[PDB]
Symmetry: T
Subunit: 155 residues, 12 copies
Amino acid sequence: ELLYTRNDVEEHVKVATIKRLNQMVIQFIDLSLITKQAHWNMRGANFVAVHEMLDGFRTALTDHLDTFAERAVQLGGVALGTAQVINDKTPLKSYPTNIHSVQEHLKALAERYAIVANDIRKAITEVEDENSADMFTAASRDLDKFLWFIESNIE
Amino acid sequence: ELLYTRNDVEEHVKVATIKRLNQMVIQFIDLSLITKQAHWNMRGANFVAVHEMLDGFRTALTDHLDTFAERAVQLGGVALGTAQVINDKTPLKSYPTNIHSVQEHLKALAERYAIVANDIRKAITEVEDENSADMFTAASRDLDKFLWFIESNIE
Amino acid sequence: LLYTRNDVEEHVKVATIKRLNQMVIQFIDLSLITKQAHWNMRGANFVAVHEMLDGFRTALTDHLDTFAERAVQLGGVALGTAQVINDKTPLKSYPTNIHSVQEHLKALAERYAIVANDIRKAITEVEDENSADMFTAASRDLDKFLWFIESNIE
Amino acid sequence: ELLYTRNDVEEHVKVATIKRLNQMVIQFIDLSLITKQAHWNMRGANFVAVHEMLDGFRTALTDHLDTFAERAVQLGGVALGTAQVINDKTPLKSYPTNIHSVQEHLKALAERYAIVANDIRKAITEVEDENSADMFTAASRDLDKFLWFIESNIE
Amino acid sequence: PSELLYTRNDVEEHVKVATIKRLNQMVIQFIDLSLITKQAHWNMRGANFVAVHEMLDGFRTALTDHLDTFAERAVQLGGVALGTAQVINDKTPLKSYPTNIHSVQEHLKALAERYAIVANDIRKAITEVEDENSADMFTAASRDLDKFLWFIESNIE
Amino acid sequence: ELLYTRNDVEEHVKVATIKRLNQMVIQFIDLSLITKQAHWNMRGANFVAVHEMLDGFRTALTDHLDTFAERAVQLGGVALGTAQVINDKTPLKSYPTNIHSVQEHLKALAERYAIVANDIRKAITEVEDENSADMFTAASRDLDKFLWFIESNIE
Amino acid sequence: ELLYTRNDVEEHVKVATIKRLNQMVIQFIDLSLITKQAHWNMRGANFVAVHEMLDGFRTALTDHLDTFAERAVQLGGVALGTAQVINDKTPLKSYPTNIHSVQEHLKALAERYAIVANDIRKAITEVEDENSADMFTAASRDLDKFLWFIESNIE
Amino acid sequence: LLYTRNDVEEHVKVATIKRLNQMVIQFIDLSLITKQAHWNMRGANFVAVHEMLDGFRTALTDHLDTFAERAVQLGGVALGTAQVINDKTPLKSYPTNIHSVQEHLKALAERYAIVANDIRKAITEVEDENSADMFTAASRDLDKFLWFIESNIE
Amino acid sequence: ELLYTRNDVEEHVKVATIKRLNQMVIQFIDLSLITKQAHWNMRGANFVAVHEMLDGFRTALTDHLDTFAERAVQLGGVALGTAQVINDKTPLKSYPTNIHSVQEHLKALAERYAIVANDIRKAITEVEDENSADMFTAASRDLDKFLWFIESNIE
Amino acid sequence: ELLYTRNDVEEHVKVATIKRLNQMVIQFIDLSLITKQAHWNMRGANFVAVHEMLDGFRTALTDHLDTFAERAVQLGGVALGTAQVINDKTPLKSYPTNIHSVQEHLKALAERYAIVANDIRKAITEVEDENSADMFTAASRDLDKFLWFIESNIE
Amino acid sequence: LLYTRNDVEEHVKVATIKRLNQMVIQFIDLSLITKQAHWNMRGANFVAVHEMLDGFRTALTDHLDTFAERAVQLGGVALGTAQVINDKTPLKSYPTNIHSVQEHLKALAERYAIVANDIRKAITEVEDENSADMFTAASRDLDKFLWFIESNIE
Amino acid sequence: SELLYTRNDVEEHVKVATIKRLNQMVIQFIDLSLITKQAHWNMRGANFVAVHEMLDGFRTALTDHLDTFAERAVQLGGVALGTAQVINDKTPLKSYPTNIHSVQEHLKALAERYAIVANDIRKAITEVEDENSADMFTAASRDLDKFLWFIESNIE
Ligand SMILES: [Zn+2]
Ligand SMILES: [Zn+2]
Ligand SMILES: [Zn+2]
Ligand SMILES: [Zn+2]
Ligand SMILES: [Zn+2]
Ligand SMILES: [Zn+2]
Ligand SMILES: [Zn+2]
Ligand SMILES: [Zn+2]
Ligand SMILES: [Zn+2]
Ligand SMILES: [Zn+2]
Ligand SMILES: [Zn+2]
Ligand SMILES: [Zn+2]
């Protein structure tokens, strides 16, 4: 069931939205862990700039997911973002540990960012909570631009 | 094994330290996630201040475990921070998914925070890399104070 | 309707303007009630909840100014006078004999909740695109505060 | 009835001074509304300077009126600023919702600002409370200046 | 066939080419508004000068910012953003701005005619485009544009 | 005994003002030791926001007192703020070092705050130096609002 | 002989007040010019700090200055800050030109600062306009500070 | 010319206004060009060159604006409409079919180099010190931007 | 003679420039006052914007002014900026005390800004000290802009 | 005897450490008051510079001060910062109230600074808590710098 | 040894100041070469590496400032004139005739690492705790810097 | 003739001459910069905390200045030299004393060297024939002459 709130968003609409929101949350938490992972372990040409870039990426991700979770609560549900749940519920493929060049990491990121980027863009139009829709549009715009930024550094 | 570098810390010392650094990166990433998890799902007496208090802790955690990972890297290791690795190598017990009182979260928070704070204070006297030890001490100081902040809010 | 190269049609100009004044009104009041509850609370969790509210006010203030200016943009008049608020406000008059933090949170709860429940249907009622956007940013903040308010209630 | 406070302003001075503070709250809140009303709905020569001048004022006014309300609550009284109390108790003539020229708005604004500026200048003499006096002086300094700005821009 | 650059970005091919198209038009209008805003800002005199003169440095920045947002989307959809002097010149729907005029009032009128055009094209653009990401961009812009038109109309005696 | 200055406040007015200033200095200095003393050792409900509130309190007390001292010196006197002088001359009840809960501390602080508050308010009108009257008013307003802040956090 | 203003203030208080405000406007202007004068032409021990100290004074001077003038105008009057009127109506002896030592310049500054300092102090309770009293008071504090600052660098 | 109390000799004014307008025209085109490169590059060194270029754009517009303002102070008309640039710029129409940073660098260099070599000469040609001063600063900027760009070329 | 300095700029250039510097200083100081004078006492159409506008000119002015006096000093001279010297040496025509409208002031200002602006423009070419030429050029660029701004608000 | 905390530093060391943390707490607070007291009653050559410098040491002392105190509390102890306690536990001699010359005050400050400074440099190696040792070195670093600034301004 | 009330042991003072001017000596020589390469590098990855070096320089300069002042604190004299760096620096002269980003990165790596490793063994070799903490902050930055420089090498 | 290639078309003889000048000014500026710190570290006596802080200000300006001269030399296709060996072998400044402590002592020693450097760059400003270079040298000279003035005005 749900936590009670004077917020009168339809009951069925609440359940489905928390549902999407959460999965969106999980995808973003993963994207933030791997952004760091790639960030630490790059090496080679274009290092520093691509290194800094990624830090930027981390923050916005963080902010966007935050909104997701808080919105899921507003509707009377329970936002999820614990290691066990992520590991258990991510669509994303585990990030490589054996890769080392900047281009390697860029390719690995591009891959992952794209799945979430494409997922969330579709979510924008299939979610019946306008607030989420506006939420989802805001994060779609950045993931897209981040997807572009990343791809754009592949040589 | 290790990646080359001009950094001349001894071979044995490097390897040992990479492992300590990494367990510490692993522990800080969970607390980090746990912190947020509690942040979103809290409700009741003293919510707003404790809610924002958690956002401060996170930034410091994040910021510390980042130094960790980078020291491991400087020593020619691979810093490890993906959901699958943390899930797999976490020393912390899964964070309750269905607790709601701020009080409830404070207590569940203290437990895990103490485990990490206690361990790292130990790590400090152990590690034989002056740098990592310095990092750890700065971290230890923050955790000890966070630990106390948490506990000091328990009714 | 005052003149403007703004080419939005008349009917939708007029219909939207009302909804915008209507909404201006609920916030100005909501704005007033927030500060009221701000000055006259005491008891547990005073300072933090007290400082919270100031934050809401500032946010409510800027959202409503966005509504008013759109109403003027579409060619009408934005109404913000005390008089107009007093008698077109759809919110129950705020109680002036309550003092405890909780009492106040509940009184805030109820009213924020009715404005936030109305602006969310509004998003999807107007046919002025820009206006649905304004509302949605406002709704997003409102629903956050409602959540913040109900989350401090014991 | 006054609420308990260790604060030892004489009981009579408390009740007297609270009533003055509220009356000042009342009209400053009224002037806050009037000021936004004028700056949304003006058009004509010197529009843009004047529209932003008024936002300057708005914030100064809401600042002082807070200082009054808090002094009221401090002396054990109850600050009154609900939509109902203002309309019922405002000494300011209602603002005309049928005027659009910058010039008309200035002239409608200079009359309502004068009453307040003059009320608050005299109230400085009248209050027994030193703190309230200082409060009113500070705020009278801003009223006299704004009033002067307002009139200076009339053609 | 597809004169589209490769990206891992789903958006269907048709929605891609049409939105790009759309994005580029808004781009061109916005750069033009930007050029003519500076244009009028430099050359205006008479009553209410410094206020209007500085009012226009504010709009410039926001146009620049939106336009930059419109260009970068196009390039994400895998297009080429076009904003060179030549493209603008024979692409702007905007009537060459008068260089023979000196009063704040006439500059206001001129500005208003052209702001109104851009103002109304981007408002339409919002429901016409099938990229949800672009309609969000356009609404943000449309909102500033609608505020800016009102600001200019308001300083006209 | 006074130090030369071209400042022309009458010999007698100086001496008395000076004595009055140092008293308010003495008791402002104490009040801040006490503000920190409570800051560190409070635990219980509402801990964090109460904790931070006081540090704000501590800053304000510090500028006011600093202003009082410099005025004494301006008049040609010596400002006294050595721990010896506070101890031997503070009219405030030594602060309890056994209490621990936030509530207990807030009560202890209310007592002491109200004393100094109720004194410096009397002082505004007792003092024959216009400048000193002003400092005291600025300071009294802060104390009167802090007392209220303290009292209002009391359950 | 005044300018229409809705600012009701007994017209005769108006006239008296404008004159005092103009006398302080004149004096503060002269002091500001004097201050730069010494600032520039200073040399000897303790140069750079005194020189920097003096810039500080100036910004305060001209700030107090401005409020005096804007108030004169507010009451229906004309603010007088012209080079001719400073020359013709200043009670201050023209600052010397032959001096160059910081010590010489501090003393020229002190004897002049004191004229103005001691003067506006009395002005405070001499004037019938309440806001002018608050103004003069704020400036009197600063003036008394700067004086004391100047005097304390004298060996 | 338009009247101003500004006593710069009439011919000087005419001459200077013209040269100012030539530089206003080139810096604008430069700035358009800078942004075109900005959106449309991909390949090695992207993120950094991308943001590098946003810096020049900012620099370019302040300077160009300083030139327009000077021309107007002298009684002339600052020109920066799309049509005038198109008709008077001496830079080759920028390619819209190129994609590599290394390509875009090469293109920016050609054009940047031209304008840079032309304002450097302008510093000593003009007979108005203020223009010459403002010309010298822009040149200094343009000479740094050209060395940055060239420097980034593999 | 000049104050001794290692600065080796030739002696005749020292004297010649010093005299030229003090000349700009005198003029700029006059402009400054005059600028503040119009800023206080104008009323009419376009008041607020023009009124704030004028405060900017002043900051700009006193900055350039400063740089001149110090250059003078560096070369071993005495910078003069006293009221008396301003009153005696000013090439600028005494400023009208009775004008009241924005246009009245604008025009009086235009006349005097233009006189100064035309002069310093020439001084750029007249003076043999490169440093002091840069100095004048910078001022010149502000002054022509300010004249332009002033003239551009005249109807 | 101690307060309950999950912090598992051993009881014995927890106790020794608190004791040592509090002694510094006491000494810093005292240097704090002393620093402020010299700041006020100083005059003579080099006044403004030294005056300002002391204002910087104060806030420095005050932060280390805080860091020591909470460490104490987070270890289960009570921090002790009360005028009474400073009186009774301070090892620093009373600071003289009869001295007036910057040069006199710098010598009185040096003595006491040097005492605390030399004491805490030893404390680093004595304490068995790494966190406090770190805590001490930072403040030690400041104290030494401050001792050198003080001494350096001596003639 | 200059008089101070700081009571470190005469012996420890003397030793510690000598180890402090050595860290001061190589840190100045490193900041010089840092700009030298900063200025004269070109090729792939120029801009970010140019600016990266600016960050490093600010850091080196602050650390070395710290060693200096400690040394004076113990009663010693700091040593940082051109002639002392030249006569006392361990590191090989930096190569004037190299231009590529890659040549420069490797030229810096070599020198940074020599200083990087010296000060890391210095931490354990000083008797002054205030110097060990000091050296340690430096080491941390220096080790990160060496990692940043090596990590850009293709 | 061994200049790095660039589309910057300043006359080639000018580039070589200007580069030599630019580099000579860089040498002096670094030495000043070195020396400044050296004094700021080792002074003691009356007026120490202000001269000390003052000096840190000088360092900052010198560094931004000398950095402009070098990026200039490099633009015209040269090599900017700033190595301890190059300052050492190529400097016009006398070796700064390491046995002075007094504030007045250090002020006098800086005064002389600041003087040396300040007076060269002022003349440089007229002797160079790349305009950007003189704008550069003029801005610097403005700071040096002011810094020199500050330093002299602190001598008792
Ligand atoms: Zn959050
Ligand atoms: Zn990192
Ligand atoms: Zn508004
Ligand atoms: Zn409030
Ligand atoms: Zn961009
Ligand atoms: Zn103070
Ligand atoms: Zn003013
Ligand atoms: Zn402009
Ligand atoms: Zn100055
Ligand atoms: Zn604290
Ligand atoms: Zn330093
Ligand atoms: Zn550089």
